[PDB]
Amino acid sequence: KEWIPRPPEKYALSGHRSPVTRVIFHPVFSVMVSASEDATIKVWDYETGDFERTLKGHTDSVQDISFDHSGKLLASCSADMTIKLWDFQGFECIRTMHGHDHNVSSVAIMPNGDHIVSASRDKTIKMWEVQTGYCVKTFTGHREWVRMVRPNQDGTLIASCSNDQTVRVWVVATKECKAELREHEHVVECISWAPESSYSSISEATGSETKKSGKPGPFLLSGSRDKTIKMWDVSTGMCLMTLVGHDNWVRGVLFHSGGKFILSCADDKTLRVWDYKNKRCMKTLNAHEHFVTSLDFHKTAPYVVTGSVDQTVKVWECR
Template sequence: MDLELKLQDALQEVTTGGPTREKRSPGEWIPRPPEKFELKGHRDTVTRVVFHPTFDLIASASEDATIKIWDYDSGEHERTLKGHTAPVQDIAFDHTGKWLVSCSADMSVRLWDFQTYHCVKTMHGHDHNVSSVTFTPSGDHIISGSRDKTIKIWEVSTAFCIKTLIGHREWVRMVRVYQDGTLIASSSVDHNIRIWSLPSGECKGELRGHDNVVECIAWAPDSAGSNISEPIPNGGIE
């Protein structure tokens, strides 16, 4: 009977794309110690960890100005990527896992070939710390956010900045692209979130309500729509 219930829950999660509403024992889903591995090697604060989309690898960024690659199945350190001259603030893989992008307090964005581990392009244009970076779903463009209050759109093939988005009044802390590639969300020290259109760069709206820095943002998947019971009030968008 318990096996049947678990199977039903699993099937429902596959269908809805998320956990079911039924109450479940925390022991079923909360990770418990001891940890499988403790990965050591960075000499300063680790700022970001991301999974490779296909291989059993993770990449970590650090304030020691390096990026490290780890095999999370074996716990082994695979490679250290060096090139930035100041803390690495954010990293992201494209959907194929062939490319890794990084941004740093050295005001640059770097593109790494994940097959050779070589930096193939360095993008300059921001005037301050670059705090966030991500790929568009197609992998053709990179989006970066900076303490210079701007968001830049870079063309991967040429490393050229094709558009600069201006609107935030303070440091842009994070940028994230909607799954269909048509919208960018950005969060800022100015307490607000902005929604931008791709590729036009037009600001579609500003979400207000936080009383302090908005550090992180994430797009909810389409499957989460049925679980959102209260819409955002119209007053939250200008």
Template structure:
């Protein structure tokens, strides 16, 4: 800091003397006068009266101005990185930021799930109002309402080509809708004895897998609607079931506070993931692109180059935590605490660098997998955030990806260009939000 000149020192001392005298600090006034050797007679009419307070408040104002400018600078820098010329470079690492590009309104009850069409800019949303609504996520326009269920629709999923949409409901039915034929309800599956919480197409699209409050997981043949397999083992309501990217494994989560791994081909129980202290709401398989970051985070040997789908999963629970697991050993690799309420939805970033979560604390959080730290919190909705999905896209060899299942490995040729940067969230506030670069 620059040294004060004699004139500045004298001005400062006289201002301090005036301040001390005006506030009746007489002993301090005389002590400063004596030590500084300055002759000064207090006078409220001099320029020194109130000078100290003026300088002090102007410093605070300047500090506030500086902070405002720094914040403005940071937001401009962020805008710059998203400018069209820079967008291509930043595209692969894109993460959502407020505000959302579109707020989709029309449902009359909380949103339970959102799902992206694999090739078109079509988004499906399921709601407790017993309907599924179809939207164009690029324009934010509403397209149609699918009616047929008589109670809350709890999950929706497109097949790999986007020809069919599957939905499940508290009315004990699973329905298939033909996207090529005016979205007609072409098949209805009965078979569960209680609310059906989750339904997914198994890779290959020959089967669907569902989970229910009747404590079972069931597989159905899409063509014949026949029940192929009933998987039992959970001790309470099964909240979520998803297949691995190659369709060989299933992961499920339950009110019994566990997640489980199953062999999809025969329903055989393979591993129990125990560690949460409340209902496990959601489970998501990590994409192969994330394996390197997860191994580094967990301190696992880097010489292990396994690219087997289904090696790691993430779970989110009502104990407000997210956990990363090794599905081979059943070990917890990392706890990700930070949310202030139930964790309801998870989606891995296509690059494999991040994990996104949605919670009843009304936020989306972005976790850096390499370090396990929460690097961004987005205030997403005015009420609980119940669902989160990453845009889907077809990848080479006819495999599909979605926000919670397998996501393409950008290291493989041809996949990097096909990343779709769009996120949708659904909430108890009855809105769906679309987040775009």
């Protein structure tokens, strides 16, 4: 609800022999999944901090991993130009999609659970079928390396962030960039949208006026290497507020499950949790001795996990 990580830690999980790139939470089980740069995906139990197993099917460094709504499948992408679909009941690779040239950066599964989206250096975004494995439609428009891609809550809207200073939002149906945003000072790297629990909380935070339908419209968030976190409106495309104060490069941003605070990490070696409605809670929390890479927020449990380059994954209580 008002959960906020505390400086004391519970466990310092260190099993990777290469920098950790992303950490996620299992949708239903008490399972933490961490992807690192040693071509291995490790499975942990965040409640008790016990190593469970590893998924060593990948060839090159694993970049991004994503579950589905049911948590029954795990989609992973790596620098070996391929996407591997993991069956989480048997923990065995079941489909290895090829193509999508050069280092693949991000991967995500829409809540529909039937199609997958991925980003890479080849300045394009591809769309895959989980059932078959055929790239049916290819998304173009980015002029540089695309870093992160994230869908909506109903499998219709997709935004991709790239080195080309553009955070441009896309549609499944007409395959057109409805909103294109090129206004960041330097490269944008991480994006994550707003759950329905926070649509009402934006109105008094920014003073935005509701349209004829009354819905505030989908929102956008994008962290950029210019040490600034900026939260946007997908429907219109204008800035609402700029969050400044990160010492070094930002790496991952997301919203609190209650939709009231802002919780994000950066290359400043610290985890910073911010309030946007009233600019009150400006807690800075040292997390890792080296650069911090990724982070995640549990939907219901009071746990947050952060992945760093120091070969370690850390779990924080929420209070």
